Ligand binder design. Structure first.
Ligand SMILES: NC(=O)c1ccc[n+]([C@@H]2O[C@H](COP(=O)([O-])OP(=O)(O)OC[C@H]3O[C@@H](n4cnc5c(N)ncnc54)[C@H](O)[C@@H]3O)[C@@H](O)[C@H]2O)c1
Ligand SMILES: NC(=O)c1ccc[n+]([C@@H]2O[C@H](COP(=O)([O-])OP(=O)(O)OC[C@H]3O[C@@H](n4cnc5c(N)ncnc54)[C@H](O)[C@@H]3O)[C@@H](O)[C@H]2O)c1
Ligand SMILES: NC(=O)c1ccc[n+]([C@@H]2O[C@H](COP(=O)([O-])OP(=O)(O)OC[C@H]3O[C@@H](n4cnc5c(N)ncnc54)[C@H](O)[C@@H]3O)[C@@H](O)[C@H]2O)c1
Ligand SMILES: NC(=O)c1ccc[n+]([C@@H]2O[C@H](COP(=O)([O-])OP(=O)(O)OC[C@H]3O[C@@H](n4cnc5c(N)ncnc54)[C@H](O)[C@@H]3O)[C@@H](O)[C@H]2O)c1
Lengths: 239, 239, 239, 239
């Protein structure tokens, strides 16, 4: 199978895109660890749920070491955990700003600074960061979120360079999804979601499996000459 | 299999990337028509060679109608045929300019103007154009080639919009390869090749199969929410 | 003045953006040669109209040599002449394709292959190519035009590299205008002007002077460290 | 003069690019406030130095209100304050991460959330964010910096949309400088400076004034139809 014998960590893996990615990987033979604040909303023999708060530095170290102790190595990392706290910038509170940067940007750093160097030392890995169409185009009411999702692209390019030093076969890429119905959209008015669908060339929102399949491509050796990239998976949207 | 029952046309399919893409498709259940000026340099039970000169408008129509007569429809098109005629712009001749625009840009139009609308009418298809790192960054000695490979991106985006009108599930994307070991690199001095490898994050040139696997991804329903995109497959190169 | 003592050639300089750019340059101390098929629709003490058909290679050389004989050198070149021949790809004729590629792509090459190397030899120059928002995003009914305006970006990057080799202070950039109210856009129904305007962040179309001021910036030493770039001047449009 | 009558705030205005921008604006008639942690290293009659720590939310409000009380309005904002704390990601400390995100991303938010809405309410303004070639390409040893300078592009696009709502003529853009000879770069070994220069098409590093001239263009009405953009001012660099 495509990921047979590979160990994959998925942050925010309890539901939504993270669930879809975990299941796609597990169906292709990966040993998957789905880390989340919440219990998994699903079961698969090759998905282990673990508690993970990507904002708790001490907790991230404990999670990382627990995975290494049990599974030996981490071949694939998907930095998928993410939140929104939307507001017009005129009204956005310090807490709305801080929380989004902490999960979506620092939380990516907190775990990658452990996993990525481990991949370099092992001479192999694939890291997939989850950006957003909002990071590529900006979006009203989302200065915090857009900063993080554009920021993830900066991390992606930097780490694609760094972790491939000294001949290490480590790739780092990002996926920038368009709009997919998950709980992250709970505060987004339906008028906007309908507008977003109409802005795609395919005239529709995406499904979680449509992101998972691209994540599977990038994690696998099929994408062996793809690194440093941000792949837009957005039905052709311009936002 | 990923392309079971699909009919795929690959221009420039006799060797190089076109051959690699044809074989990848053929191994995933597609019936492949490999169109080229030259005889195929390989065989496969699912690949049929046909004469195709993408610059001969009348011949392209004949080729197209022959494929439709045999198989009834075309589900996948890869516009891969391409040439170089390198020269500094200071010295480039009219013939060097004209030939490259004719194959690499008009040739893409000549066949796609038949296949793409047929996909739109059938309600389904996937078109993969082959750009180049040179279209994304430019390159010394290649203004003609760069114009065409950047031009192909304009075609890609336009057609991703046009052929998905009226609810048609037609996707159009481009692959921009970096430097891949094929015959098109015969004329490039070896010192420059070594330089090219060092410009990649992976510190190596690519193999044809590394492009073929991405072409397979895009042709398949795995890429169902990917359209209008140019995927760089270049080992992280900046040129 | 910003361009005092410089000699500038503007193709398509009889009206529209070409006229606005010519006048902006002429008001900043440049001697401007406005080349066009038609007579200039304006006059200025620093603008000389000359016949130029960018598609006639022999005539382009005659124009070039005439300008050099009179003016000694050309410091600035704006490759502005351009046309559309719109059609859905399914109906686009060979002539509609050919004419647009010949003016908008080959025409740029035809004059630049003389002027650019001359700037390099002289140790100084600035070239401004005119792309379009359509080259950046594609547009239904404009595959030919989109191919050319995306292709111009490939030319831009290539020439920025080539003409600055061996110590020459030659810069090459492009402007990608959004929808600008030239004679041609003045005819379109208001209902549709409103539509394009609504795709911009400023909720309006542009004026020709708004392109000219950017062309003045890039031609001038204010842009001395800007090369290889395509500047979108489009009110924040996503098309 | 180009900015006569306009009030401009420049963060990090005591030295480096901020100084160059402040002086360029002052020479074109702007009333300039240069905010910084330290005293200005220069004098000009139309530059007022003020204490500003962009990371102190409360102090930022006090600074903002002081400027409004004295000058009435803020027409132009340049978010230039920035720091580096370089480290390979494997060694980067939490403090190195935190400080760079706080200045380079949150600091931009802290002041813009006051100034930008004020521009929207006044119906006019121009905001210039300072990104970097590192935000566009990534760079080894600079994951924190790259995250922030890519993030600034996300902010730029978001605010170009938000602050122009309801017909307000507010533009938001970014400049991404290449390697510019400010104080730190002068101390790097000559071998390295030559290496960096060799990555540019012009084979040289930039001077601060070359950034300031672009900042002047964007602040001015010459850039009236430019918004949502990131302008690379890098000599044609690929990093
Ligand atoms: N659904 C979309 O339209 C869309 C579009 C673009 C990008 N994204 C991104 O996709 C990713 C996944 O989001 P989703 O749409 O599945 O949303 P979701 O809310 O359904 O799932 C997010 C998951 O991440 C978790 N999480 C939140 N904070 C965490 C923390 N501190 N530590 C560990 N886990 C944490 C949640 O508990 C949750 O299970 C996010 O990065 C999001 O920004 C989503
Ligand atoms: N190999 C690389 O490094 C690289 C990088 C980027 C892009 N590309 C491109 O990928 C494509 C394939 O190139 P390749 O590397 O396999 O080169 P190649 O020279 O090995 O193969 C090209 C094939 O196209 C065919 N062809 C040429 N003109 C034709 C015409 N008028 N009609 C029909 N067929 C024609 C050739 O006969 C040949 O079989 C090209 O578009 C090329 O520009 C290659
Ligand atoms: N106006 C817009 O909204 C817009 C947007 C994006 C790009 N553009 C581009 O800006 C440029 C200027 O367009 P415009 O709106 O001013 O159009 P225009 O039609 O008003 O003017 C074009 C001028 O180019 C000249 N020209 C055409 N073919 C020529 C040839 N073979 N040789 C010499 N001159 C020739 C014409 O005679 C004419 O004077 C074009 O490249 C156009 O594609 C325009
Ligand atoms: N010089 C370059 O090559 C280059 C390239 C790309 C981007 N940049 C960026 O340009 C900007 C200016 O850089 P520079 O080269 O002039 O650097 P610099 O270090 O010479 O000057 C930066 C100034 O911002 C200041 N500053 C730092 N923290 C602050 C805070 N909390 N509040 C207020 N002011 C603060 C400093 O006191 C200093 O005066 C930075 O954002 C930067 O990262 C510089």
């Amino acid at each position: 199978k495509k990921l047979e014998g590979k160990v994959a960590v998925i942050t925010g893996g309890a539901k939504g895109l993270g669930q879809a990615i975990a299941l796609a990987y597990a169906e292709e033979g990966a040993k998957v660890i789905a880390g989340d604040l919440g219990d998994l909303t699903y079961s698969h023999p090759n998905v282990e749920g673990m508690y993970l708060n990507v904002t708790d530095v001490t907790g991230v170290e404990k999670f990382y070491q627990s995975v290494i102790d049990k599974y030996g190595k981490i071949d694939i990392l998907v930095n998928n955990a993410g939140i929104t706290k939307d507001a017009m910038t005129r009204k956005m509170t310090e807490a709305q700003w801080d929380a989004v940067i902490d999960v979506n940007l620092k939380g990516v750093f907190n775990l990658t600074r452990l996993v990525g160097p481990q991949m370099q030392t092992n001479g192999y890995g694939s890291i997939i960061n989850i950006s957003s169409v909002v990071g590529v185009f900006g979006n009203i009411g989302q200065a915090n979120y857009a900063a993080t999702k554009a920021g993830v692209i900066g991390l992606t390019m930097t780490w694609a360079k760094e972790f491939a030093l000294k001949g290490a076969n480590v790739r780092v890429n990002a996926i920038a999804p368009g709009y997919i119905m998950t709980d992250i959209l709970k505060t987004v008015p339906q008028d906007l979601l309908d507008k977003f669908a109409a802005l795609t060339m395919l005239n529709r929102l995406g499904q979680p499996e449509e992101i998972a399949k691209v994540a599977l491509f990038l994690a696998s050796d099929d994408a062996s000459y793809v690194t440093g990239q941000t792949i837009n998976v957005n039905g052709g949207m311009r936002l």
